[PDB]
Amino acid sequence: DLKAFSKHIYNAYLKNFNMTKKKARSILTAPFVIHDIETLWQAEKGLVWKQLVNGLPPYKEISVHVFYRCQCTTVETVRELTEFAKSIPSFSSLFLNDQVTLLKYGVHEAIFAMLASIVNKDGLLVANGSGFVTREFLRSLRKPFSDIIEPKFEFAVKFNALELDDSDLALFIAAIILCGDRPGLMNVPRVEAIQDTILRALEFHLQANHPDAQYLFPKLLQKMADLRQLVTEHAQMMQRIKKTETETSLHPLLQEIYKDMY
Ligand SMILES: O=C(O)CCCCCOc1ccccc1CN(C(=O)c1ccc(-c2cccc(F)c2)cc1)C1CC1
Ligand SMILES: CCCCCCCO[C@@H]1O[C@H](CO)[C@@H](O)[C@H](O)[C@H]1O
């Protein structure tokens, strides 16, 4: 039951996410360092990116260009999360409208949790591990673009202190997506039931994987609550950008995610 449950989730996680925390940590211990405008330019000229630069919206400025690259990665991680979720039998058993509801309100929490895997206190990996953008450079962007980034590093460094591996994260992320609290859900009892099974699997798994860790399971439950507050603040900053940065393009999928959030 729960052992094979977890194992199926773990394989779904390995199957659908290109960058795993294992791969990321090895690199973070070399990548081209982006820390100013010149190295950013060189990086765009020199590094392979998943989305091609001319494919981005028309250029406006440096801070906005960075934002577009963040937005590109966000949308790509949504696609991965969707296929990850669909690789879970109980998720695909849900009516398609409930699937969309869970992803809509779940993906950003899952993204910011997984983000910690490619983050340290000095910056984060970009371009599939080919580059490393410094936290200080991201801090130097003009508001509101620098403001929307720093809160994630703060969460990330604290989160990495728990020292989860990929197998723990697969269950953690599954639990975030299969959440019975999401607005507009049709079959709440069914999602609550799946959520409960995942959380049992998570505890079972952590007992085995981290036998000497103390209070880790309730600590992770608190991280789930923390991520909700993080995403609320994020959505508020995105609404601010929408209203005060009219020249900045917003990806339509992300726009569909944000119109009913406060
Ligand atoms: O939510 C939206 O509406 C999309 C909008 C998000 C905006 C805030 O995004 C971030 C905030 C904090 C940390 C990371 C991200 C974005 N992410 C990245 O992986 C990422 C970070 C930096 C760069 C990059 C690339 C080139 C130059 C440069 F200076 C930076 C590329 C990708 C993770 C969440 C997807
Ligand atoms: C797969 C069976 C066909 C599903 C048809 C039901 C569509 O319902 C719609 O689901 C959306 C969430 O996904 C909500 O945002 C809309 O308010 C709601 O009207």
Structural domains of the chain, ranges and CATH numbers in brackets: 1-262 (1.10.565.10)
- Rounded Cα distance between 166 and 10, Å, is 8
Contact between 102 and 178 (Cβ < 8 Å): yes
CA angle 130, 153, 211 (to 5 degrees): 95
Preceding omega of 58 cis (within 30 degrees of 0)? no
Contact between 173 and 201 (Cβ < 8 Å): no
Contact between 26 and 52 (Cβ < 8 Å): no
Contact between 228 and 109 (Cβ < 8 Å): yes
Distance 69 CA to ligand 1 centre (A): 6
Contact between 81 and 112 (Cβ < 8 Å): no
Distance 93 CA to ligand 1 centre (A): 32
Distance 128 CA to ligand 1 centre (A): 13
- Rounded Cα distance between 64 and 80, Å, is 24
Contacting residues for 255 by C-beta, under 8 A, at least 6 apart? none
- Rounded Cα distance between 66 and 145, Å, is 9
Looking up tokens 């993906």 gives: 107
Contact between 178 and 195 (Cβ < 8 Å): yes
Ligand nearest to the CA of 33: 1
- The experimental method, as deposited, was X-ray
**Alpha-carbon 149 to chain mean position:** 13
Pick from 216, 228, 219, 175: nearest CA to 197: 175
Secondary structure string (H, E, C) spanning the chain: CHHHHHHHHHHHHHHHCCCCHHHHHHHCCCCEEECCHHHHHHHHHHCCCCCCHHHCCCCCCHHHHHHHHHHHHHHHHHHHHHHHHHCCHHHHHCCHHHHHHHHHHHHHHHHHHHHHHHEECCEEEECCCCEEEEHHHHHCCCCCCCCCCHHHHHHHHHHHCCCCCHHHHHHHHHHHHCCCCCCCCCCHHHHHHHHHHHHHHHHHHHHHHCCCCCCHHHHHHHHHHHHHHHHHHHHHHHHHHHHHCCCCCCCHHHHHHHCCCC
Distance 70 CA to ligand 1 centre (A): 3
Q: Whose CA is nearest to atom 10 of ligand 2?
A: 97
Pick from 68, 63, 102, 65: nearest CA to 85: 102
Phi, psi of 200 (to 5 degrees): -65, -45
Q: Whose CA is nearest to atom 4 of ligand 1?
A: 71
- How would you class 212 by CB atoms within 10 Å of its CB: exposed for 0-12, middle for 13-18, buried for 19 or more? exposed
Distance 240 CA to ligand 2 centre (A): 28
Amino acid in position 128: N
Residue 42 token pair: 């060189």
Contact between 81 and 103 (Cβ < 8 Å): yes
Neighbours of 233 (CB within 10 A): 13
**In the structure, which protein residues have their CB atom closer than 6 angstroms to any atom of ligand 2?**
95-97, 100-101, 184
Q: Which of 68, 70, 231 to mutate to test the pocket of ligand 1 (most atoms within 8 A of CB)?
A: 70
User: Of all atoms in ligand 2, which is nearest to the CA of residue 96?
Assistant: 1
Resolution of the coordinates in A?
2.0
Residue 194 token pair: 């799946």
Pairing state of beta strands 131-134 and 32-34? parallel
